[PDB]
Amino acid sequence: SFNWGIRQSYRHYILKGAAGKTGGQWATQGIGFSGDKTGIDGAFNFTPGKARIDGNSATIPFPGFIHFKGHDHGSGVYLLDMTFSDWKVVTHGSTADILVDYVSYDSDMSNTKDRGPKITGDDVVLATINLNTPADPASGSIDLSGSTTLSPEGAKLFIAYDVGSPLDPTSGTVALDG
Ligand code: HEM
């Protein structure tokens, strides 16, 4: 199991912040959750698929999606509507990239009637793990614990955060068999 809470302050925003006061929620398929929902130890739980090895680089898939919603301001439409699927982690020695397919919508955070334009991204790097131990695919297992920073492409997706902002730390050792 690979564990990551994306960002604690983002999960607090969806459930208790300005998104949470206007219909904020999340839903998952294939992915669990453990810990405090708006807390530091809270993390989504990703189950690995069959890994793919290219030398010293493992690409580990994790099936399922995470769907965040919020900001119903009475128009019948969720103005925040953010789906994260096709989770994969590609290791690059001492770092690992977290890859997603997203569907989201842009916003100026002012218009409470009109949903902004759809944005998608396929095989987009969302974050990079500075790994505690370097990833070796020849050992049969990869420890994914480490600290994370937000990518330039996820920073377009999350809007409010800077490029290279810290995200939630990761944990868990997964096997590569399936
Ligand atoms: C009309 C719609 C929206 C309004 C009025 C709005 C307003 C706000 C407000 C008041 C905050 C401050 C909350 C806080 O700091 O605790 C906030 C933060 C934030 N908003 Fe929005 N927002 C809207 C839509 C969106 C959308 C579509 C996104 C999608 C990317 C988004 C992403 C964020 C993020 C990431 C934060 C930072 C949360 C954190 O970690 O503390 N917002 N917004």
Numbering used by the authors: 37 to 214
Q: From the publication, what sentences describe this entry?
A:
C. diphtheriae secretes ChtA and HtaA hemophore proteins that bind ferric heme (hemin) via conserved region (CR) domains. Here, we demonstrate that their CR domains scavenge hemin after it is spontaneously released from Hb, and define the structural basis of hemin binding to ChtA and the N-terminal CR domain from HtaA by determining X-ray crystal structures of their protein-hemin complexes. The CR domains in ChtA and HtaA adopt related β-sandwich folds and coordinate hemin’s iron via conserved tyrosine residues that are located in helix α1 (Y129, Y49, or Y361, in ChtACR, HtaACR1, or HtaACR2, respectively). In summary, our results reveal that the C. diphtheriae ChtA and HtaA hemophores scavenge hemin after it is spontaneously released from Hb.
The crystal structure of the HtaACR1-hemin complex was determined at 1.88 Å resolution. It crystallized in the C2 space group with ten complexes in the asymmetric unit. In the final structure, complexes containing protein chains A to E are well defined by continuous electron density, while complexes containing chains F to J exhibit weaker and more discontinuous density. In each complex, the HtaACR1 domain adopts a canonical CR fold that somewhat resembles ChtACR, but notable differences occur in the positioning of the strands at the terminal end of the beta sandwich, with strands β4 and β10 being discontinuous in HtaACR1 (in HtaACR1 the strands are referred to as β4a and β4b, and β10a and β10b, respectively). For example, in HtaACR1 a “helper” histidine side chain located in the β6-β7 loop (His107) is positioned to hydrogen bond to the axial tyrosine ligand that coordinates the metal, whereas in ChtACR a second tyrosine residue (Tyr178 in ChtACR) fulfills this role. Protein-hemin contacts on the opposite face of the protoporphyrin ring also differ as the conformation of the β8-β9 loop in HtaACR1 is significantly longer than in ChtACR, and it harbors a methionine residue (Met145) that is positioned near hemin’s iron (the Sδ-Fe distance is ∼2.9 Å). Its close approach to the iron is made possible by differences in the α2-β11 loop, since unlike ChtACR which contains a phenylalanine in the α2-β11 loop that caps hemin access from the solvent (Phe271 in ChtACR), in HtaACR1 the phenylalanine residue is replaced with a smaller, less intrusive alanine side chain (Ala196).
